[PDB]
Design a protein around this ligand. Structure first.
Ligand SMILES: *Cc1cc2c(cc1C)nc1c(=O)[nH]c(=O)nc-1n2C[C@H](O)[C@H](O)[C@H](O)COP(=O)(O)OP(=O)(O)OC[C@H]1O[C@@H](n2cnc3c(N)ncnc32)[C@H](O)[C@@H]1O
Ligand code: HEM
Ligand SMILES: CCCCCCO[C@@H]1O[C@H](CO)[C@@H](O)[C@H](O)[C@H]1O
Ligand SMILES: O=C([O-])C(O)C=C([O-])O
Ligand code: SF4
Ligand code: F3S
Ligand code: FES
Lengths: 102, 139, 242, 614
């Protein structure tokens, strides 16, 4: 894609917006659908986010390869664990409600 | 003539092997509120992500489920002040980052760039953060 | 005359011809009653009267040439239009533009900054330039106005050397100054290479290391907004076709 | 002698010294023509004084009313008070429209009219119909920052050619051999090294020397270095005594306030609120020639109508103009007035006073940009050496330059040197050898200033020279004062033997570079004030209160019918040629005739001297 970098920049913002929209959605319509939407958006937004950080702060072909590899693992496992929490346990929305009861 | 790339390669080549010092930056530079809020936005984003990661790791690795830990904590019937404190601490970064995040999306549409508007939006972000955070730590 | 007002200036020093010399800060005292109102007046008095080894770039003396950019009291600015601070209880610290290789004292090596500017091809380009010189190109008052706030730049570098992204990735991030000039050519109605100018910024660094910190605009001695120009480039990147 | 300094040798077809408007245009013109060209400059190009230019550049484009370049020719010739060479003036003015259209096509962002064409404003001393038709509007501009745009546009344009730049290299002298220039020797300021650039042709475009004075609009870097190189080479400089005091430098800082202010309707006012120029120049008023307005303002101040607490300046008033106009036509000075005088130009007048601004004199050239020498009554080009821009005396400006004519001169003669070299040489011709030790004396002098340890420090000797020119070679002059000034300067020059410098390094040693600049300014200053003392007549900016008349070969104030023409030796309508013996600092003068012929009498009539008034 000759327009890769700008298509990424646009997706990043599309996702940030997406996630903003999920906050009200979690409060007003909690349940599976939002629970998975949040698992996917929290991971995607955080993965791109931590990647801009590596990009600004990590230098050298190898240290960059390493940071990005470690990030891809952190993210894959993070989206996995969140889907897991949603399938086998109460799920993000309900967990927040419960924690807010303490 | 030297092309721009050649000029760039010799600059690095000359200087990295020179004995020239690198002038100070971050240790001498004057802060501003916008600058401070900027790096706080990055710091809250990283913290929020690390938190979401730690929580998903606990989901894959701890022996009990969420309801047991909630109950455990409750069985300590902790003081309301402390509870409030903690909820406030939890929601503040999320809060700060969401509102300043909205300010960044507004900048992405090209609006609010006069420097005096940058100072205004930052302060509107701080007060909404504080308000929404006291609001929520109270629910 | 008789009744002084002595100000102290703590200024960055480093001599490359003194083997093993280390950067140090030197302090000078100047009678504000016998010096011009600007920091450059002070730097010139010091050089002329106390220490002619103090070295710095300067030329126009009215803030149009861009030579004297440096960091004063924590911020990047032109010494020649920067008022000397009258509160005598404070020492004004002076350093070279930030995160730059120091040639000597307050003189940074700006050659990478200039090579980034050459790389965006800052000159008018027409598809058919076979008519260069025959007649004036027409441009409306309204399209000429689009250039206001972009063309006044004096390439002093206060902005890019204030930008933390530029501090961390100055080898590949073009920085605020050059990006605002690339925008100045992208919107000149008389230029025919807008898509190619945008196409050149399709990589992770040239443009995208800007995260809207806004130090650039706060620091500009000409009152320009490079941070805004950049946001307008990002929008064009996101919408142009072909 | 010993090379304590390593020497690098370069060979090019051509070398351009200077990278302001004239040098950049000459240097890429040469590369565009195929010549392997080097451009040597002591500043990064866009820092050059050209960047500070404001009001505009003239060309009869006729975008505001019908115009004729010959009307411009006339204005310039009258403005030069007949000390201008009309062949050069012909070339300059006829070439103007194409030179400006060239800049616009390069991308120069000129302000625009309702037709999308370049906007032009009124400026001083310009008219329609050879003087009979009212105010011209031919000064093309980019609001009031024309210089800035002109320089940035030329610089961006040079980036398209293969010109080799040696930025922040300080040229020391010319490499002369047998009356011919073989190149130049320079100090690379960044690494302390010495470089000799050999080339078949050398172009000098180093700027003026306003800094020989104490108060000037000129940048700190306007120190006549190229001029001094010519002088050191034993070549003549010309008309150096004609120094332009611009009517309006801001009081105190000296910053230029554009004549565009008055071109757009601003007015000069004395302490009594009188628009005194209606009195001194009833027709032109505040748009009369600069030598005139400056003399008038100066008269108003010594006669008591001065403004401010010391009654020592006057007022430039713009507040009666609509604010949009000031914001659109005059934004730079609007900002400058406030930063340097605290004035809000929509409310209060700007404090102003006549300020040394520009050098009419310089290295003499023919209209093709070739430097000339003058032997036994004839002009001879110096093979291999060209000059253009304020450092030259072509002379399109004679005794007084019209505003907006210098930026024009820059581009027209910088292109002219490139054209002339291109019709005279071919790229790649063998570059002339230079004796193995060419330049060694430049290094010797440099080494000697580095370690200088006398009793008079560089800044001291410089301030001495500045205050001397300031009170002895000002707007109004007289023999006694000029003579005193001459002797004080000659003394200060002997005194350079006692210079003390402190910096002993070689990398970015501005202690030493500014000492080389002092030598340079001293050579220019000596030629100026001795040329002035010798000139017993009043012409353009050179006003002698003891020789109040302009003296030409005829009395052009009565019919020439039955008038005995005066002998070359008994009148002053001739260029001054100054030479300096650098060891002693003694000045020699000679004169050469002004050229009245144009490039084509059928196309552009030569204009005979006449009484000059606005
Ligand atoms: C002072 C001034 C002059 C001026 C003006 C406003 C101000 C504040 N506004 C003008 C206007 O609106 N219209 C107009 O026609 N003229 C105006 N002027 C006068 C005009 O600007 C100057 O006459 C003109 O710009 C002259 O420029 P030129 O090209 O001749 O050179 P320069 O810009 O002054 O630059 C000198 C160059 O030479 C190099 N140099 C000098 N010494 C050395 C040594 N030793 N070695 C190598 N290079 C040298 C400098 O680096 C510089 O590039
Ligand atoms: C929970 C959230 C997580 C786990 C999260 C995490 C991240 C991270 C790690 C960053 C990168 C920081 C940086 O680039 O400096 C990022 C940046 C940002 N996020 Fe979030 N954030 C969250 C919610 C939100 C919300 C609801 C919005 C709206 C928001 C808007 C932003 C935007 C706009 C940026 C880009 C900042 C820039 O351009 O510099 N995020 N976030
Ligand atoms: C020392 C690090 C934290 C400083 C945070 C706030 O800092 C302040 O912000 C103001 C508004 O932008 C500025 O005008 C002011 O100079 C600055 O000190
Ligand atoms: O008043 C000006 O803008 C000016 O200084 C122009 C010339 O030509 O010298
Ligand atoms: S945008 Fe401002 S600060 Fe940046 S280089 Fe240009 S004038 Fe200097
Ligand atoms: S300070 Fe830097 S991050 Fe962007 S807005 Fe300015 S270039
Ligand atoms: S000396 Fe020219 S910008 Fe300060």
């Amino acid at each position: 894609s000759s327009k890769a970098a700008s298509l990424h920049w646009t997706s990043e913002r599309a996702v940030s917006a997406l996630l903003l929209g999920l906050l009200p959605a979690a409060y007003l319509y909690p349940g599976p659908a939002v629970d998975y939407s949040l698992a996917a958006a929290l991971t995607l937004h955080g993965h791109w986010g931590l990647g801009q950080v590596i990009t600004d702060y990590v230098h050298g072909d190898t240290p960059i390869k390493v940071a990005n590899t470690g990030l891809y693992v952190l993210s894959a496992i993070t989206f996995t664990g969140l889907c897991y929490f949603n399938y086998y346990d109460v799920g993000i929305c309900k967990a927040v409600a419960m924690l807010w009861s303490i | 003539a030297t092309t721009a790339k050649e000029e760039m390669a010799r600059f690095w080549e000359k200087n990295t092997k020179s004995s020239r010092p690198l002038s100070p930056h971050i240790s001498i530079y004057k802060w501003s509120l916008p600058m401070a809020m900027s790096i706080t936005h990055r710091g809250t984003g990283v913290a929020l992500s690390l938190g979401v990661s730690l929580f998903s790791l606990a989901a894959l690795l701890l022996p009990e489920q969420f309801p047991h830990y909630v109950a455990v904590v409750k069985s300590l019937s902790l003081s309301p002040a402390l509870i409030y404190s903690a909820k406030f601490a939890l929601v503040f970064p999320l809060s700060y980052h969401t509102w300043n995040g909205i300010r960044h999306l507004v900048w992405d549409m090209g609006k609010g760039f006069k420097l005096s508007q940058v100072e205004q939006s930052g302060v509107v972000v701080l007060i909404l953060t504080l308000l929404s955070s006291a609001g929520i730590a109270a629910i | 005359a008789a009744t002084s007002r002595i100000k102290k200036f703590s200024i960055y020093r480093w001599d490359p011809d003194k083997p093993g010399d280390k950067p140090r800060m030197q302090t000078y005292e100047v009678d504000l009653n016998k010096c011009g109102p600007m920091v450059l007046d002070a730097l010139i008095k010091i050089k002329n009267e106390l220490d002619s080894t103090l070295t710095f770039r300067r030329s126009c003396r009215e803030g149009i040439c861009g030579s004297c950019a440096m960091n004063i009291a924590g911020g990047n600015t032109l010494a020649c239009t920067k008022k000397i601070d009258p509160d005598l209880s404070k020492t004004t610290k002076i350093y070279p533009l930030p995160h730059m290789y120091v040639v000597k004292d307050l003189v940074p090596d700006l050659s990478n900054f200039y090579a980034q500017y050459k790389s965006i091809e800052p000159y008018l380009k027409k598809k058919d330039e076979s008519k260069q010189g025959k007649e004036q190109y027409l441009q409306s008052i309204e399209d000429r106005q689009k250039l206001d706030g972009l063309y006044e730049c004096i390439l002093c570098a206060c902005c890019s050397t204030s930008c933390p992204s530029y501090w961390w990735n100055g080898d590949k991030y073009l920085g605020p100054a050059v990006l605002m000039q690339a925008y100045r050519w992208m919107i000149d109605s008389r230029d025919d290479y807008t898509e190619e100018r945008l196409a050149q910024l399709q990589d992770p660094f040239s443009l995208y290391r800007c995260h809207t910190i806004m130090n650039c605009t706060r620091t500009c001695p000409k009152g320009l907004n490079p941070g805004k120009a950049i946001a307008e480039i990002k929008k064009m990147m996101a919408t142009y076709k072909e | 002698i010993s090379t304590q300094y390593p020497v690098v040798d370069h060979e090019f077809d051509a070398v351009v010294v200077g990278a302001g408007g004239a040098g950049l245009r000459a240097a890429f013109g040469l590369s565009e023509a195929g010549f392997n060209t080097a451009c040597v400059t002591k500043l990064f190009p866009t820092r050059s004084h050209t960047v500070a230019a404001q009001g505009g550049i003239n060309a009869a484009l006729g975008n505001m009313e019908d115009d004729n370049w010959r009307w411009h020719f006339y204005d310039t010739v009258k403005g030069s008070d007949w000390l201008g060479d009309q062949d050069a003036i012909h070339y300059m003015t006829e070439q103007a429209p194409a030179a400006v259209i060239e800049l616009e096509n390069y991308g120069m962002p000129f302000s625009r009219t309702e037709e999308g064409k370049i906007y032009q404003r009124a400026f001083g001393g310009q008219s329609l119909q050879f003087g009979k038709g009212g105010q011209a509007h031919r000064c093309c501009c980019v609001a009031d920052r024309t210089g800035h745009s002109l320089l940035h546009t030329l610089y961006g344009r040079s980036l398209r050619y293969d010109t080799s730049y040696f930025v922040e290299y300080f040229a020391l002298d010319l490499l002369m051999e047998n009356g011919e220039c073989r190149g130049v020797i320079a100090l690379c300021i960044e690494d302390g090294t010495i470089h000799r650039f050999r080339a078949k042709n050398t172009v000098i475009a180093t700027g003026g020397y306003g800094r020989t004075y104490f108060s000037c609009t000129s940048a700190h870097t306007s120190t006549g270095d190229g001029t001094a190189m010519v002088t050191r080479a034993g070549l003549p400089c010309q008309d150096l005594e004609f120094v332009q005091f611009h009517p309006t430098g801001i009081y105190g800082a000296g910053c230029l306030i554009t004549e565009g202010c008055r071109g757009e309707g601003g007015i000069l006012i004395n302490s009594q609120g009188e628009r005194f120029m209606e009195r001194y120049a009833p027709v032109a008023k505040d748009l009369a020639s600069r030598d005139v307005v400056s003399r008038s303002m100066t008269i108003e101040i010594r006669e008591g109508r001065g403004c401010g607490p010391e009654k020592d300046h006057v007022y430039l008033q713009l507040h009666h103009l609509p604010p949009q106009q000031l914001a659109t036509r005059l934004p730079g000075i609007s900002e400058t007035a406030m930063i340097f005088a605290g004035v809000d130009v929509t409310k209060e007048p700007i404090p102003v006073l006549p300020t040394v601004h520009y050098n009419m004199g310089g290295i003499p050239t023919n209209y093709k940009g070739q430097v000339i020498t003058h032997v036994n009554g004839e002009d001879k080009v110096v093979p291999g050496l060209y000059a253009c821009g304020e450092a030259a005396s072509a002379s399109v400006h004679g005794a007084n330059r019209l505003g907006a004519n210098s930026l024009l001169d820059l581009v027209v003669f910088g292109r002219a040197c490139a054209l002339t070299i291109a019709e005279t040489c071919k790229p790649g011709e063998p570059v002339p050898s230079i004796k193995p030790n060419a330049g060694e004396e430049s290094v010797a002098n440099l080494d000697k200033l580095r370690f200088a340890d006398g009793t008079i420090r560089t800044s001291e000797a410089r301030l001495n020279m500045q205050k001397t020119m300031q009170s002895h070679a000002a707007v109004f002059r007289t023999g006694s004062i000029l003579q005193e000034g001459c002797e004080k300067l000659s003394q200060i020059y002997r005194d350079l033997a006692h210079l003390k410098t402190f910096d002993r390094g070689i990398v970015w040693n501005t202690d030493l570079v500014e000492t080389l600049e002092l030598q340079n300014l001293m050579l220019c200053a000596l030629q100026t004030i001795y040329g002035a003392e010798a000139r017993k007549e009043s012409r353009g900016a050179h006003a002698r209160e003891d020789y109040k008349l302009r003296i030409d070969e005829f009395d052009y104030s009565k019919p020439l019918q039955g008038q005995q023409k005066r002998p070359f030796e008994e009148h002053w309508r001739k260029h001054t040629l100054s030479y300096v013996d650098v060891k002693s600092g003694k000045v020699t003068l000679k004169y050469r005739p002004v050229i009245d012929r144009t490039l084509n009498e059928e196309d552009c009539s030569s204009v005979p001297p006449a009484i000059r008034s606005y």
